[PDB]
Amino acid sequence: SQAWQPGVAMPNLYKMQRMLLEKCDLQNYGDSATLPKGIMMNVAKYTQLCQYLNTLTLAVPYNMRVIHFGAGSDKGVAPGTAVLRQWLPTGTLLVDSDLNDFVSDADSTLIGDCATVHTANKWDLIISDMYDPKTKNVTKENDSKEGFFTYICGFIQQKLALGGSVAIKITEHSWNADLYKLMGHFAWWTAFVTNVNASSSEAFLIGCNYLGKPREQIDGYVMHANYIFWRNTNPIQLSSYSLFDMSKFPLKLRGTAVMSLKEGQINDMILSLLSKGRLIIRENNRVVISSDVLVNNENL
Amino acid sequence: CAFAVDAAKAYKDYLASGGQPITNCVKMLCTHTGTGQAITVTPEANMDQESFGGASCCLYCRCHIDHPNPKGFCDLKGKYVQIPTTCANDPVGFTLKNTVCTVCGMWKGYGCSCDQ
Ligand SMILES: [C]O[C]1[C]([O])[C]([C]OP([O])(=O)OP([O])(=O)OP([O])(=O)O[C][C]2O[C](N3=[C]N([C])C4=C3N=C([N])[N]C4=O)[C]([O])[C]2[O])O[C]1N1[C]=NC2=C1N=[C]N=C2[N]
Ligand SMILES: C[S@@+](CC[C@H](N)C(=O)[O-])C[C@H]1O[C@@H](n2cnc3c(N)ncnc32)[C@H](O)[C@@H]1O
Ligand SMILES: O=C(O)CN(CCN(CC(=O)O)CC(=O)O)CC(=O)O
Ligand SMILES: [Zn+2]
Ligand SMILES: [Zn+2]
């Protein structure tokens, strides 16, 4: 049974359907897991996410570069960043960002709308827990959303190293059709529901090993519908069991190889190594980031 | 001009007055089979300790004030601090009020056995 897993990933037969989009109606909606003593929800949530990422083919190069969007919290701190830095090998470059100010253990933190964020270099792993509170004001058909999803799609296409991976928080109403389409540009993809939040429509949309071109054409409107269909017909038991075994939590430093390479040079052997988590492609220069700042003189 | 805000004193006195300790310190899941050292690059709690994200346990970080250090560097941020389970109600107070032995790396008085 599923309850001893960190969470549940979308079974493949659901990925293959052509469902229409219904309202999400989960039988355990509102129930809260019992969390171990003194542990915040988002430490449990991120712990389970990382426990699941440990079962995939992540590239893990020396001097890994990881960027974490939506890392702030109403508490003024960054529980997610703390778990990622725990999980990631020591000395992994971790940058994070949020719209509102917070205190972080990341190596560098940028405050502002994510669309203001720019980076010279590419990344081996992108994490987003962004969620707009206005998504709660459902006033119409659940359409594809833009905003930070539009930024994220472009950021991936422009600044995710080949062989890199992503995990991007969605919900029933906080979702984007191009993001699903772009999952077709990875070797493998899923939607992963943590067991501590099994009662929520939240999932992490995980793209494993980026290939820079489509393996598969995905209709994002259809696929979100498939995902809601899965959630609607497979209730998940809230469970905190996996939180109690942290013996194998750390990400194994694979020392994955990094090559700069031009588009001409990406042949089917290179593409094979990307698919297997055995290669990263990007510059290996220094990591430089910035936030765009709008200037206004309010006087007169 | 000699003036500087003494936030350490402020919190120590607030606690002494019976003030509610700073909260939302970020506690980590770990095996609790670690070294017990005070401040580490990954959680190192033993069975007598809880591990926390450093930044959230630092009084200067949490209060949005400058670090008492010429270069402003912070001892805790980017790291994990192990807190005696008996003081994990006030991790900020603990790290402020206590000291780390430069020799063994354990909290002077809460693991340091260099006097024996
Ligand atoms: C910490 O991270 C947060 C969460 O962990 C994570 C999302 O979790 P969630 O809240 O559980 O969300 P959800 O209800 O499952 O999906 P939705 O898109 O919000 O649905 C919109 C609307 O549709 C209805 N709906 C949805 N579903 C699935 C239903 C149901 N009704 C039922 N009777 N049965 C159901 O199954 C209901 O009215 C919902 O409100 O996102 C973060 N987050 C949330 N809110 C904020 C925030 N962060 C910052 N500020 C915020 N204000
Ligand atoms: C559930 S919270 C993040 C909680 C955090 N990851 C943690 O570890 O506890 C959702 C976050 O997404 C951020 N967010 C929403 N829209 C954003 C945007 N356009 N740019 C940057 N951050 C955004 C919010 O400010 C908010 O802190
Ligand atoms: O303005 C920006 O830089 C990001 N935009 C998205 C523009 N993207 C390109 C795209 O459309 O995919 C630019 C980028 O992400 O680099 C987000 C928004 O409009 O809210
Ligand atoms: Zn500090
Ligand atoms: Zn000592």
Swiss-Prot record, chain A:
Signal peptide: none
Subcellular location: Host nucleus; Host cytoplasm
Residues annotated as catalytic: K45, D129, K169, E202
Mapped LRR repeat ranges: 18-42
Domain of life: Viruses
Catalytic activity: a 5'-end (N(7)-methyl 5'-triphosphoguanosine)-ribonucleoside in mRNA + S-adenosyl-L-methionine = a 5'-end (N(7)-methyl 5'-triphosphoguanosine)-(2'-O-methyl-ribonucleoside) in mRNA + S-adenosyl-L-homocysteine + H(+)
Record's subunit section: Interacts with nsp10.
Role noted for this protein: Methyltransferase that mediates mRNA cap 2'-O-ribose methylation to the 5'-cap structure of viral mRNAs. N7-methyl guanosine cap is a prerequisite for binding of nsp16. Therefore, it plays an essential role in cap methylation of viral mRNAs, which is essential to evade the immune system, especially when restricted by human IFIT1 and IFIT3. May disrupt host mRNA splicing in nucleus by interacting with pre-mRNA Recognition Domains of the U1 and U2 snRNAs.
Protein name: 2'-O-methyltransferase nsp16
Covered residues, full protein: 6800 to 7096 of 7096
